[PDB]
Design a protein around this motif. Structure first.
Motif: not given
Length: 1278
Positions: A968-970, A974-977, A1108-1109
């Motif tokens: 899975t591509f999380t 919208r890429p989270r740093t 989310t975390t």
């Protein structure tokens, strides 16, 4: 005569090539269009015979005719609840009709009466009726419009066709003699030709200039056109002073002699083009389920393979050649390597005549003429890239409707994939519909042109991957397409991609061919291994040195500054004096190039960095594209440009800039970048990829720390081996951190990456890893040059010799060599400030990730498992002595960029990991004798084509089943740093994990109503290997993961200073003779046996619970106390018991009864096969008022228009309870009545009852509203 009434004998199924089982129908009339099949067996395609006479096509037509009378297929339409409504089976439709249109082309339709039917069958009905529907896609903007994908019945039964028609590329002759992998391989190295030594390159004559040296002058490569039609005045690149070994017949690549029973495709590109029935067809159709005439046909378009082939680059008409031309041709040819960028010998799947053209002959340019200055001129070719049956059907699947066009991105290629074949999607097909979808246009664009605009900034993970190309599109990307889907408002194309060739980038020294068999076979097309095999001894210092320069120093004594055995220790420094004298002294011109006497050389990383098709910041930047990978070697997902896909023209016009030079004179002054001429349009196709991912968002050394963190599916044990005691405790396979000794940082080597301006609040000290070189245990801060290459006749290289020294204008002759060199030259070497000494590279890191998830990374074997050939870990494996032979680091023949011993331990080859009783299989770096070794498989059979369907999880995430792991591509959308951006869920059913054809148990992935993605598994549907010939033979058995690994043979390892110098091999052509025991384990079944597996579930596998975390590895990326790679290793180690927190885990399973064939998915529900579809309990009390019960007076007397809001088209809230029966005390606002049709004149009010779903606050149709459906007409006593 309800011609399309639901046939109960038919049941849902999933097509292997795309994994389509049902289309989720959205909109006004929701539901599903699910694939449906007859489950009769005892088919024997064996009955259909081939009387030698006529051909493959004649045989095929006969099989399709057989299957026509046996198999049965339709696509049935299900209502929003999952209940079947009608079937639509093309074979059993007696009176199929095209839809009536208006003058505008808009079909004639009444919501109740249905479509107006012409009464004419759609175009080419006789060929297309027999075809099998494999995919349904609905038009997004136009309603009632859908599109069906049709393939021949034969395309399904492809693998069951006659053994002499559908076969493997690897010839297995019916001999019980003895197994020698090298038997098919050409291994005899070239020799000096003697006939013409005038073809040996000349030195420069002469030229104040400050620096000077006694080193042998540069070799001049002169090229002049002259006034000749067929000849050049000078053509030094053509100069070939070497020749093939003459064994009373040349040791050269001849397709005639080698491929006697040559692999050929089922049908040529022209056959599929002509034979309408033998190709894929896309039929536009209309569908209103609650209407009378509910089905109608539209446009029937055949997917002409020629339409794709037409738009291939002109580079591709001559693929046995490349822009470097004649110098590279002779060089590769002599080195018994495949020529070009796409050679039939490597990938025959794309050539119309398959293996028949599997050699280097007739490349489309004059080669080997009696007079060399007649070579490199454009001649007649007969070997272009095409699209035969095999590769064609691999590109049939995954279709999407964007505006007025329908696109076909292709499937995973499983429909035509054999164990030794890799059929893949070469491009996209697009049917551009016009005039209310009444007119059409079909075209095909290869991925190569669509991906031309590829640059490093588009990815957030690994950088410099070989995905670059140039004006002649030498990089040929192909895919095992997962799917094309909208992830939010972004168009994502996912699956696995074929990167550029990385494992054959280095070139051997003309004599070293017989010592480096594995590598030769990779170039020869025999060993279809994409991974880099670490056999570096024999490499030539540079792959781009032309044949003329190969015999300047024959004996070797001179350490031939031009051409020599690649060794980064004897490389020259970048000091002004060295460069001034050895490089700038010679100046290239219009008619002259130089083979500089400056000693260049470096390991894997360096070789790749300069001669691979690495990604940069500019597109079409690769001056070197070696070749293309055999199998998909990279995870790949990309955000595509919808407007470009829909906008772009059908025919793509290239220019002379996309064509190779007509002669070696024009070729000589070629600029790598050319501006497209205004008459071309090719350039406009380059940027369809907006961004892309290739795995998690990690780079270089940091990435390796993750590679260890993940486990191996077969064991459940991680590559790290970090859980424990003893000091001889296993080390990690991919990491260097805490492995070996911590070396001290200084000696930046090239590209002026000096800095030193900002020094960090910590000591950066790099770990050497395993197989390191140290002066003494006390001195671990660089290695003095004294541990030097002493190569020719045991007379060491002298650094201070007259030629190895330079003297500036004034005096004091200093040497060109380095004083100290890095503390590792092993495969696991990772030197950030010494590219030239580094072996670990991103192109490998990428493959390694895919391959660790597939769990098919090979291991080097020295000792089998047999009573007299064992590996006692407790005695032979000393984890603390990695510096010596006790560390058992091969340093030759193993997979580059990893520690073989740790991989073997991880695989439980030796140890309790896999088998409860130590299998005692391994590698013993022996100090007493010459070592004989061969790589072997892990025992798993997963392929990089085992790509399931695409699952969109939310507006920012998506995933798919890749082998046994659901990726899975999380952090793509919208890429989270500080997040890794990957979630991996491993399968649990061991009977599948280890199985012989494991992907045959896969029955599609689907996002469930709960929000989590799920995958269907059916081990009963596991296909067994082809046949137990004889008792079960006595030789190699071809399996999906089967590879033809060649033996490696090295001299006895040293007790002390082992990996100080590169490991020296010896001839191994003969070595196969004694490896009978080990060679046995080249076959999967045998390793499965020794590991206590193979011989002795069924349901749905849900992914891990992520939040989310989840994936937040920010703490591990901090460069606070240690360098990024170290801090991450520490972080992963701390999080070893809770891998779930990061996103790595075991996918939970729910047992299911019976064979699972597929799912039927409506927006409301996903039913495995046709599991209990029930009436909606929410709407069960809502119903329309029976005709009699209507009031008639209240606003039904006065016009119809007064009962609904003309703008919204909904019945005014007030009349709603007048028309519908509702339970006492029901919320009027949770139901609505849309006006489907109305006639003021005839006093008719057609409505559909909708209800606000409590789950999703959207309106769903009250299917129980009427006896017929949620639709009804209200009319005064009529």
């Amino acid at each position: 005569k309800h011609q399309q009434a639901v046939d109960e004998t038919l049941t849902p199924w999933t097509w292997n090539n795309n994994n389509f089982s049902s289309l989720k129908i959205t909109g006004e009339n929701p539901g599903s269009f699910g694939l449906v099949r007859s489950q009769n067996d005892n088919l024997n395609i064996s009955s259909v015979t081939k009387n030698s006479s006529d051909d493959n096509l004649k045989y095929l037509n006969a099989v399709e005719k057989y299957l026509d009378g046996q198999q049965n297929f339709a696509i049935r339409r299900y209502d929003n609840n999952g209940r079947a409504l009608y079937d639509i089976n093309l074979a059993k439709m007696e009176n199929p009709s095209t839809v009536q249109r208006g003058l505008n082309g808009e079909p004639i339709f009444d919501p109740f009466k249905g479509f107006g039917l012409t009464g004419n069958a759609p175009t080419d009905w006789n060929e297309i009726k027999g075809k099998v529907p494999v995919e349904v896609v609905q038009s997004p903007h136009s309603p009632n419009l859908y599109f069906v994908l049709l393939v021949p019945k034969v395309a399904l039964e492809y693998h069951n066709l006659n053994n002499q028609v559908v076969k493997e590329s690897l010839e297995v002759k019916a001999t019980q003699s003895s197994f020698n992998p090298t038997q098919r391989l050409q291994k005899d190295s070239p020799v000096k030709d003697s006939s013409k030594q005038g073809e040996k390159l000349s030195e420069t004559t002469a030229s104040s200039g400050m620096a000077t040296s006694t080193r042998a002058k540069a070799l001049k490569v002169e090229v002049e056109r002259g006034s000749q039609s067929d000849s050049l005045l000078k053509n030094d690149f053509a100069k070939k002073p070497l020749k093939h070994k003459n064994s009373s017949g040349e040791v050269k690549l001849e397709a005639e002699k080698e491929f006697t029973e040559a692999w050929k495709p089922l049908l040529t590109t022209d056959q599929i083009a002509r034979e309408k029935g033998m190709g894929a067809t896309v039929v536009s159709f209309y569908d209103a389920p609650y209407s009378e005439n509910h089905t109608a046909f539209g446009l029937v378009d055949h997917i002409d393979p020629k339409k794709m082939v037409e738009n291939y680059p002109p580079s591709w008409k001559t693929p046995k050649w490349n822009h470097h031309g004649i110098w590279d041709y002779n060089a590769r040819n002599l080195l018994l390597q495949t020529t070009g960028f796409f050679n039939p010998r490597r990938h025959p799947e794309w050539f119309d005549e398959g293996q028949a053209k599997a050699d280097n002959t007739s490349p489309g340019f004059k080669v080997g003429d009696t007079d060399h200055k007649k070579d490199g001129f454009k001649k007649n070719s007969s070997s272009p890239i095409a699209l035969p049956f095999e590769a064609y059907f691999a590109n049939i699947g995954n279709m999407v409707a964007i505006g007025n066009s329908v696109f076909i991105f292709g499937g995973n290629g499983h429909a035509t994939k054999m164990f030794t074949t890799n059929p893949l999607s070469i491009g996209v097909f697009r049917i551009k519909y016009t005039d209310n979808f009444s007119k059409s246009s079909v075209t095909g664009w290869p991925y190569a042109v669509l991906f031309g605009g590829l640059i490093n900034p588009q990815t957030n993970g690994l950088k410099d991957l070989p995905l670059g190309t140039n004006r002649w599109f030498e990089y040929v990307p192909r895919m095992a397409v997962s799917g094309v889907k909208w992830v939010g408002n972004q168009l994502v194309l996912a699956g696995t991609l074929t990167m550029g060739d990385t494992a054959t980038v280095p070139r051997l020294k003309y004599d070293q061919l017989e010592k480096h068999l594995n590598l030769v076979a990779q170039g020869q097309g025999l060993l279809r291994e994409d991974l880099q095999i670490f056999t570096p001894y024999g490499w030539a210092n540079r792959p781009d040195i032309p044949v003329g320069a190969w015999l300047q120093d024959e004996m070797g004594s001179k350490f031939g500054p031009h051409y020599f055995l690649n060794n980064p220790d004897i490389q020259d420094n970048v000091n002004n004096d060295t460069v001034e004298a050895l490089i700038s002294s010679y100046k290239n011109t219009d008619k002259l190039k130089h083979v500089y006497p400056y000693r260049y050389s470096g390991l894997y990383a360096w070789q790749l960095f300069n001669w691979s098709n690495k990604l940069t910041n500019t597109p079409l930047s690769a001056n070197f594209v070696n070749e293309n990978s055999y199998a998909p070697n990279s995870l790949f997902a990309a955000i595509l440009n919808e407007d470009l896909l829909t906008g772009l023209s059908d025919k793509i016009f290239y220019g002379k800039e996309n064509e190779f030079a007509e002669n070696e004179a024009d070729r000589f002054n070629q600029l790598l970048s050319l501006n497209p001429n205004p008459n071309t349009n090719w350039a406009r196709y380059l940027n369809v990829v907006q961004r892309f991912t290739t795995g998690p968002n990690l780079d270089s050394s940091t990435f390796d720390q993750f590679l260890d963190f993940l486990p191996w599916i077969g064991n459940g044990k991680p590559f790290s081996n970090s859980p424990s005691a003893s000091s001889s405790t296993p080390l990690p396979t991919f990491s260097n951190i805490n492995v070996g000794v911590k070396s001290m940082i200084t000696q930046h080597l090239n590209k002026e990456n000096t800095r030193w301006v900002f020094i960090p609040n910590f000591s950066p000290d790099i770990w050497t890893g395993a197989g390191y070189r140290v002066q003494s245990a006390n001195q671990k801060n660089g290695i003095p040059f004294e541990q030097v290459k002493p190569s020719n006749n045991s007379t060491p290289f002298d650094p201070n010799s007259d030629d190895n020294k330079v003297t500036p204008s004034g005096g004091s002759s200093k040497p060109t060599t380095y004083p100290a060199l890095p503390n590792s030259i092993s495969p696991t070497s990772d030197w950030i400030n010494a590219l030239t000494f580094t072996n670990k590279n991103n192109p490998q890191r990428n493959q390694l990730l895919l391959r660790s998830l597939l769990g098919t990374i090979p291991v080097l074997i020295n000792k089998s498992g047999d009573s007299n050939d064992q590996f006692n870990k407790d005695s032979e494996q000393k984890w603390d002595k990695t510096e010596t032979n006790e560390g058992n680091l091969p340093g030759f023949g193993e997979v580059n960029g990893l520690y073989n011993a740790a991989l073997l331990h991880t695989y439980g080859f030796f140890g309790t990991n896999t088998n409860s009783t130590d299998p005692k299989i391994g590698f013993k770096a022996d100090s007493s004798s010459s070592s004989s070794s061969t790589l072997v498989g892990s025992g798993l059979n997963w392929t990089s084509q085992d790509v399931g369907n695409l699952v969109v999880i939310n507006d920012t995430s998506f995933g798919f089943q890749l082998g046994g792991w659901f990726i899975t591509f999380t952090d793509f959308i919208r890429p989270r740093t500080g997040y890794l951006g990957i979630t991996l869920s491993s399968l649990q059913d061991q009977t599948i994990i280890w199985a012989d054809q494991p992907w045959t148990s896969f029955k599609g992935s689907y996002l469930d109503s709960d929000g989590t993605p799920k995958s269907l598994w059916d081990p009963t549907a596991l296909k067994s290997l082809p046949n137990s010939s004889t008792t079960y033979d006595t030789n190699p058995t071809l399996s999906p993961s089967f590879q033809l690994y060649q033996p490696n043979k090295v001299k006895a390892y040293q007790t002390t200073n082992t990996y100080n110098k590169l490991i020296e091999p010896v001839d191994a052509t003969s070595a196969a003779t004694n490896m009978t025991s080990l060679l046995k384990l080249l076959t999967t079944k045998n390793i499965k046996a020794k590991l206590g597996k193979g011989t002795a579930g069924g349901g749905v596998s849900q992914t891990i619970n992520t939040i989310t975390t989840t994936g937040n590895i920010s703490e591990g990326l901090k460069e606070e106390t240690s360098i990024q790679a170290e801090t991450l290793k520490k972080f992963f180690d701390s999080k070893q018991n809770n891998k779930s927190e990061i996103g790595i885990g075991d996918s939970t399973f729910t047992k299911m009864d019976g064979k699972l064939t597929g799912v039927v998915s409506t927006p409301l529900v996903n039913l495995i096969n046709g599991q209990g579809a029930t009436s909606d309990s929410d709407t069960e009390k809502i119903s329309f008022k029976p005709g009699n019960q209507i009031d008639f007076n209240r606003l039904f007397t006065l016009p119809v228009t007064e009962l609904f809001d003309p703008n919204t088209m909904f019945v005014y809230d007030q009349y709603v309870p007048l028309l519908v029966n509702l339970p006492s005390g029901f919320d009027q606002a949770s139901i609505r009545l849309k006006v489907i049709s109305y006639s003021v004149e005839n006093q008719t009010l057609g409505v559909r009852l909708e209800f606000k779903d409590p789950q999703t606050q959207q309106f769903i149709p009250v299917l129980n509203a009427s006896s017929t459906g949620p639709q009804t007409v209200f009319q005064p006593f009529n």
